[PDB]
Amino acid sequence: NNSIAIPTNFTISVTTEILPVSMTKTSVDCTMYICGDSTECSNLLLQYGSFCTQLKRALTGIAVEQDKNTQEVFAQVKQIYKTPPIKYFGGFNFSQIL
Amino acid sequence: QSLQTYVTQQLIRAAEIRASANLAATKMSECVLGQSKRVDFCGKGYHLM
Amino acid sequence: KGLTVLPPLLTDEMIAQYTSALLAGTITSGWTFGAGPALQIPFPMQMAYRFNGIGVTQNVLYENQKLIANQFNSAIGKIQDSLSSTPSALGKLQDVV
Amino acid sequence: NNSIAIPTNFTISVTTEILPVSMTKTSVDCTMYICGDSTECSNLLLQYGSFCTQLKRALTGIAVEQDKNTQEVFAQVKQIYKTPPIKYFGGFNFSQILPDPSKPSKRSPIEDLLFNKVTKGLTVLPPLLTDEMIAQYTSALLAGTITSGWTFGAGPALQIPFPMQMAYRFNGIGVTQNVLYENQKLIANQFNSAIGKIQDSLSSTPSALGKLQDVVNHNAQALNTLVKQLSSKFGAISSVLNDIFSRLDPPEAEVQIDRLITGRLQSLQTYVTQQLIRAAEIRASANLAATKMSECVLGQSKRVDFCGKGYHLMSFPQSAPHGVVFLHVTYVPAQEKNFTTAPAICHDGKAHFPREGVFVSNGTHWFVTQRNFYEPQIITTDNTFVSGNCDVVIGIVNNTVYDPLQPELDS
Amino acid sequence: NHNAQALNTLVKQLSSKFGAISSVLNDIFSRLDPPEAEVQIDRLITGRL
Amino acid sequence: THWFVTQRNFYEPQIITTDNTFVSGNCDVVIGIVNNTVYDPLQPELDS
Amino acid sequence: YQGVNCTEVNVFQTRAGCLIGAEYVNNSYECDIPIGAGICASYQSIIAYTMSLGAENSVAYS
Ligand SMILES: *[C@@H]1O[C@H](CO)[C@@H](O)[C@H](O)[C@H]1NC(C)=O
Ligand SMILES: *[C@@H]1O[C@H](CO)[C@@H](O)[C@H](O)[C@H]1NC(C)=O
């Protein structure tokens, strides 16, 4: 009840956190994937439906989203700031990050 | 069917990536652009920069 | 096979320029750039403000500045070795690929 | 090393954030879509059985989720607070945000503008909370924020004068109360101007409400695709079930009908799966909206960029179709000037550090000022704390620290 | 509950013919020659997948 | 043997003074209260 | 009945559709079963009522 622990020294710790922001953007040619180069099956594919358009739309949406994700994470600066030519900052070395 | 499966899996993966990107954007504003008082949001210990 | 990879709109070099802008602002302007136009501040004073935020008085930073700077430099040096030494750290990105 | 920029002026900025909260609730009748009015098809469908039930369950779960999402974002008030009839609030005009009695809807002018801007066995189910009810919840939140500040979120509403509440928010951002009181008329004028600009900005740009429109468009596109898929043969002789029955012998006809049934079931499954993924995205947005409502509308947020760009002062919620618009009032530093700065002042062989400020030099004199706004003050024992000696500190500058006690002692 | 319901649904789905003569594969093999059986089995396999 | 006031996250012992302490109530209500001198800055100047 | 006028098919007309077997009550209570369009049903018999968002309160500003 009457005892406390107070730190008498400090440690500066730099830790690395890695977060994925974007994924590969891909597009598929429905006809080439299913029919290859055969014309007859292509006609049959036409009969099956409009699924290929739906698939293309979904993939295109993913691609646009990936570009938006990168913009959100990185394009938070109105102007591209440039570091001062003399890199002296109170004994702190930012060479690795800079 | 194979193509449909690929698209569905990609949509789910995209949702996971979007969540990670949103977290990254949140961290960039909260940690890079300011000091964060939230515990463990920007590293173990008391966040400085 | 009809499967194609579409190039990202932002090139890696452009992303690096955005990152460089963020670093330059943080080192020179502290947190001001996030909340408005960039405001110049000495980096030691910025660190002192950050110390005040965590509840430690600014005097500690100024009095122990050399020690704090050395510790920061050592930590940054350790990070490069740590990332190279362990593949798991970069595993999340690799997993996506 | 020795230069600091301290803002000498401020700008009150209102920014609008549009977040989708709900999506259209849809129900599908499996028999109607797959088989139409054909009894023979219905008998064949019974063999598949559970697939239809599973699809219905998934859609029902999405619909209940949407009602929950709206409740979470808006039903954060247990009582419907009513704004007092007198509308004077320290020179701040809330007419655009507050409800208009003349309108039958009773929606606010900004809400009305937002409302105007947004534009086979498949049915759309009405949302449980009507737009008028959502507006009433929004009005309660606005009344609480304007009259009781942040108290209503954390407990029973506690009345506070609005200028005083604004002063507390200034203290939250690190600016002293005096700045608000001394410049109250200017701050009020800036706030009023910003609100008027908000109405014009939303009206001028169609893309401003684009996120909400995108949700509506995607749901419409999905339904249209589902209806179109009915025409597709799926490798059967004909899309029409009756034509297959009429032109083919019963065993072969059954095989062709089975091909149509399976294709239509696949089409419904694709729609349901896509809707589930979209629902997850909407739920994430709804959770974000609820968090914003609590952190920004019901409190002052110290998080950076969570509630607008700049130092957040207050946020106001406005209902929009299938979404919430947050008006974020922020403090933006302006008119920065450059002053020489020193970490510590050395007086009487002791190191003096600013208690809650930064030492700044006009050129011949040294003053202590708050970081956010430039208010130079004479260095005194009251505003500084003495730790250590001059030697340890780097960049320390020699100057006199006045003592209030000494003149009285001399007298 | 959701996990239990999903598993129960799969077990229930096994009953569905999917346009085949019978849900039971052994019955199809016993009653039909390999060419006809292949078509019926294919329908069952596709539905179960 | 001596009582000091310090910042929570780092050990910087300081003499207890009126400046660093605020006075509320009387001794009886508090549980665990201890008796130590609180220095007043004005008193030495007044004595001089 | 969803989307059907009452005449077309204890009768109340709601935006969702016609409701039969529940008697509309002017008094408002917290929602028990959500019919939709602001109309909720509870067992008191079965009654349909417009849901009450909250008890009205007037804040005081001076
Ligand atoms: C900062 O740099 C200037 C030269 O630009 C130098 O004269 C001064 O001593 C430096 N200050 C510190 C604290 O190192
Ligand atoms: C602290 O705990 C001890 C027993 O460990 C007890 O004797 C003493 O009275 C307690 N002091 C207070 C202030 O509760």
Residue numbers in the entry:
A (entry chain C): 709 to 806
B (entry chain C): 1002 to 1050
C (entry chain C): 856 to 952
D (entry chain B): 709 to 827, 856 to 1147
E (entry chain A): 953 to 1001
F (entry chain C): 1100 to 1147
G (entry chain A): 612 to 620, 641 to 675, 691 to 708
Give excerpts from the publication.
Here, we describe several potently neutralizing IGHV3-53-using antibodies targeting the RBM, capable of Omicron cross-neutralization, extending to BA.2 and even BA.4/BA.5 sublineages. Structural analysis via cryoelectron microscopy of a representative broadly neutralizing antibody, CAB-A17, in complex with the Omicron BA.1 spike highlights the structural underpinnings of this broad neutralization. Here, we demonstrate that a common class of public antibodies can develop broad cross-neutralizing activity through affinity maturation.
To define the structural context underpinning the cross-neutralization of Omicron, we resolved the structure of a CAB-A17 Fab in a complex with the Omicron (BA.1) spike. The cryo-EM structure of CAB-A17 in complex with the Omicron spike sheds light on the structural basis of its broad SARS-CoV-2 cross-neutralization. Based on the structural comparisons, the neutralization capacity gain during affinity maturation for the most important SHMs of CAB-A17 can be understood structurally within the framework of reduced entropy cost for binding through the prearrangement of an Ab paratope.
